A = this chain, B = another copy of it.
Amino acid sequence: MDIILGIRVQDSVILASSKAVTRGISVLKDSDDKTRQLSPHTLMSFAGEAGDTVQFAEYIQANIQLYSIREDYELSPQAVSSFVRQELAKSIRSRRPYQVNVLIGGYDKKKNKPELYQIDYLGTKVELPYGAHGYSGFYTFSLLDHHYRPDMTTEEGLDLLKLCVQELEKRMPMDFKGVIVKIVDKDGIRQVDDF
């Protein structure tokens, strides 16, 4: 875990997430997918304490999928994010809190609008045009402040994302073994294989 990014553009939400899983002085895996599909039009990336991340992500995934079956209806990105925040807001005052930070990228089919939420392990939710967790933000936020426009296309958003990854690969101390990129739009969720 370490690098997770998010960019909301005109018609979609793009999430980038590093592939490295390190422990000690060894990179145990370089092809790791740090995300879970909560619903057809909602994707959550995660980062934080080992174990806690996947355990939390799948626990949320299970709950949202249970809701979808029960109501035969997909929860809005706003509704899912509020559910996730409350779970973390409970967690922080537990005997052993989930130390997990997440980004929730989703396409609201009722509003026909993409939405990006950033939530930390304390339960601090914010909607953003672009987001990042961990040390990534210290480079990407200022970069996006400059280059980001609200009316960009998905192709323009991917180039903007390439610009972020290039900067991180240049200035970050740790090797994070590249990123897996995923796009969330009206047609659902798909993965960019060649990045």
Chain A residues in the interface with B (C-beta under 8 A): 20, 22, 24-27, 30, 135, 138, 169-175
Contacts and interface: CB of A to CB of B under 8 A. Distances in A.
Nearest to A175: B175
B25 A173 contact: yes
A25 B169 contact: no
Contact of A173 (B138, B169, B174): B174
B175 A173 contact: yes
Nearest to A135: B25
A169 B169 CA distance: 13
Contacts of A20: 173
Nearest to A2: B173
13 contacts: A25-B171, A25-B172, A26-B171, A26-B173, A27-B172, A27-B173, A30-B170, A169-B175, A172-B175, A173-B175, A174-B174, A174-B175, A175-B175
Nearest to A20: B173
